[PDB]
Symmetry: none
Subunit: 543 residues, 2 copies
Amino acid sequence: ASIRDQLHTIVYRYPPTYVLSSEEQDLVWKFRFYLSSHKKALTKFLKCINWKLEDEVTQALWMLANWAPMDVEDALELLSPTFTHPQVRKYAVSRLAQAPDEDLLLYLLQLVQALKYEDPRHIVHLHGCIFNLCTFLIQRACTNATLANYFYWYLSIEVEEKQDERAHDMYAMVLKMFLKVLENGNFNLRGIFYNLRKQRRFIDELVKLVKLVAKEPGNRNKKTEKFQKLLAEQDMFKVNFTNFEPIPFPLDPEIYITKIVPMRTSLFKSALMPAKLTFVTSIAHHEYAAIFKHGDDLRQDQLILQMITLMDKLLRRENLDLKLTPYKVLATSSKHGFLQYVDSCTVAEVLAREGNIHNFFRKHHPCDNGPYGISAEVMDTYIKSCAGYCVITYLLGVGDRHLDNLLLTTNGKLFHIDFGYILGRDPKPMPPPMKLSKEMVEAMGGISSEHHHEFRKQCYTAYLHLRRHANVMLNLFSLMVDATVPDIALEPDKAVKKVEENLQLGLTDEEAVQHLQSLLDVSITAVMPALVEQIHRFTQYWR
Amino acid sequence: ASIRDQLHTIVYRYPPTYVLSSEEQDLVWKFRFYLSSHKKALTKFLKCINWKLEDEVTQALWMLANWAPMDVEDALELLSPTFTHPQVRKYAVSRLAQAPDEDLLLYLLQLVQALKYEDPRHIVHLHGCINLCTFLIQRACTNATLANYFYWYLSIEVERKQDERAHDMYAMVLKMFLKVLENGNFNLRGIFYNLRKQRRFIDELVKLVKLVAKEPGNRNKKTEKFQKLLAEQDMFKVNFTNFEPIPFPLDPEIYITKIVPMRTSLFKSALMPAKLTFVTSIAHHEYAAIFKHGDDLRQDQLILQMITLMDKLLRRENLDLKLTPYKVLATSSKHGFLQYVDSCTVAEVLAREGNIHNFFRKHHPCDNGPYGISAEVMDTYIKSCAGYCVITYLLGVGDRHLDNLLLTTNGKLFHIDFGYILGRDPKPMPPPMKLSKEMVEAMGGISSEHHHEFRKQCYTAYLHLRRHANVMLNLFSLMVDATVPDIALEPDKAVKKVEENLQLGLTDEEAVQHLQSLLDVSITAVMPALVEQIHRFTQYWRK
């Protein structure tokens, strides 16, 4: 019908986790038969059928075979715990199979959690065969070396020591099966297996060394000295850190390492003391650095970093480059991992060493002409980084921000780090909704500036695009409900709702921008002491 | 042609005071030939041609005469010093001829001011005889209320070294007008007889009032004296206890027979206003007015004309914000009349009845009513609030306090007194928007449905007025040499101050955002909970 279409388009194209559809179910259904407008339609169609009858199930399943094929993002929802039925799940797996590896890696973290939701019987039967989704992950991980790397590391965190007992047992089973398939396959499959073993041996020895450093009494500098001496001690360990045979790096399976440089290694002023390491690579003695951190479970951080990477990709697709830095994390075990090292200086360091951010930029990229005697791109990128981070931190509810927590680079970028507080948890009783240092606002030229205005403009458009891609972020959050990420595990059932609450999906675009602006304004006013003075004066007016 | 067609629609609909299109006006010239499309086309056309010297002129008039006739507002701009051509002004005055008497009444204040602009010759040759001055006179004679206001607006102005000659011109003009009335027919003679009747009365009331001031002492003492001077028959040229019916200078439709002495009271203000009760010719109806001896009232009367103009525009849009444009006229500098509306000051309401709701509750209590108040009173309150906030913002009205704002039993809120205009405040700060704390509680505070409607009403009033910006700007233009206190300090800046609050550069949503921002600061300042929250947010980055 003429209007019939709009009532339905709002349903295909707006609600994402809504149970909202009810009567709609009967109407979508009657129209379900004539027109599968979009893949988006299909996810919606699915919701009403499995509701009870088998007669309903048979008709719906046929509808599915012919329907315009779902997008991976929607397929993700299908692996979700809400839909029991074997045919829809086979279907979700077929949709992923169609996907390219790069896309598969992004989601993989979620797919590993997705495993929890499949029937154990499929997993036990495959175990029986060696001694769809699960067979699929193994089959594909074998196909491509970097995928295998991630698959392995994700499975290991899961396997190591109520319903947990059941889930651990399942993961243990997947790992034994994956490892046994690899040992057995050919040159290409065995090659993968040998490499994983080399990483496994290397990390264990690395862990032994860090523990010795941890034990040695002393301040940062004395411990770092002990750490440097240890690396250089050859054949005190099962591995010789000064030389080894090439091992694909767990953060980046693409780079082999072969060496560490004992004297280049530092420890962070951070309170857990991360090593930095340098390695050399298999190529032309290149360096890599990474961090190695031995205090917390990096899982919450990989989730957030995965989230930042995803958002960066979506904005980049729409031709919005907020110059974000989505660095790499893996955890090894809970309690160790790596993180990518990006050349950066924390804001507090910058403030203490140079008077203020502008001075810092100006030193690295002076341009007499302007904006502030700083080359424009640097100003432009600082502005974009700020807006991307401000919106992304708000959406994900990142708490516990401070001057140690934000960093800068020489190019301009700002980014965040250390995502221990997430989804509105904070060590302090307050917000602000938006997280901006007085220093960051001053860095922008203050309240009225070609640049500050530019910063707000960027937040709003960033916000609008992110809102549009709510389906993927929400589906991914849905799969992390039993995830063993601390902040999520406090009320698992509330986590997705909170992300969704921030997305402000009810509101119209014009309305949503006003909302962000509102949050932005309180935050900036409380941070700037003249604005607080102005409010003090206004109260004073009415007397 | 097509996109260039859009750039054309851009020039007509958007600005009234732009210097725009200098190299570009000849571009407008090119498509103007074929496109005397609509009225707004014209005002722009004239701006381009006339800047150049001698033949552009003859071509333009042929074009003008051929042009789809100009709207009356456009006409207002043509009277100004920006256009000095005799022909164009003739045309502008022909446009005025088209206008209804009511529209004339409105513009007539600015129309009187318009006279200051050329030509001096017209006045002197019409005087010699014994087309703008002529027009105004001819029409004053047609309409009795028109004539009334014309007379009063003239007599104030006749009561810098180069401003001294304008006075001369006003004088020449008033007397010509008065002479036409003397020499006129039955009807003109009648109006004239009535204007004179009004003078004597004004002078006799002035004498009485001066004598109340001459006596020194208490407020009760001065009222006693006032009552006695009114009751004293024939100690004055006019007997105030009863006199021959005269049309009220404030409201020419009403005639007055007498004043009631015992009913008169004096106002709280240090300079002490008198409230008079008048009896009218009809059904012993009574009229209440205020008579003020202290200050020149031209500033109050501009603001009220503007409030009245604005109300009409809104209501034409069928937005009735339930503003109250009480009529004001200044007889002379240092005395005039004010329409009186039965009202209670907000300070007065608050001291007498604890809070504002109690006041509304006293008069219109409904048990299922919002606040134990009738639903309609709460609505009329919200709307008046909204209306006034925006109008006050636009006109930059200062010196707001709780004696300045009064409430009716009906729920309307309105602003009483316009000492400070166009941004001037005795006090050093805004707030840009004026809301007492008590007013917001009266709405039931920020998290209420009424407060939301109030804001929603603000934005909407604002958007609409923006659309009618041209009328207001032109009205203001003709007020540059006005003899209003606040225009006189910065004549050149005055128009620009109103135009700036209109924010025409902004697109509609940006405009709404802008207004949200001002409302936000203004309301936070006032509410202590909102201030404390800012305290806590500031505290967040401290440690």
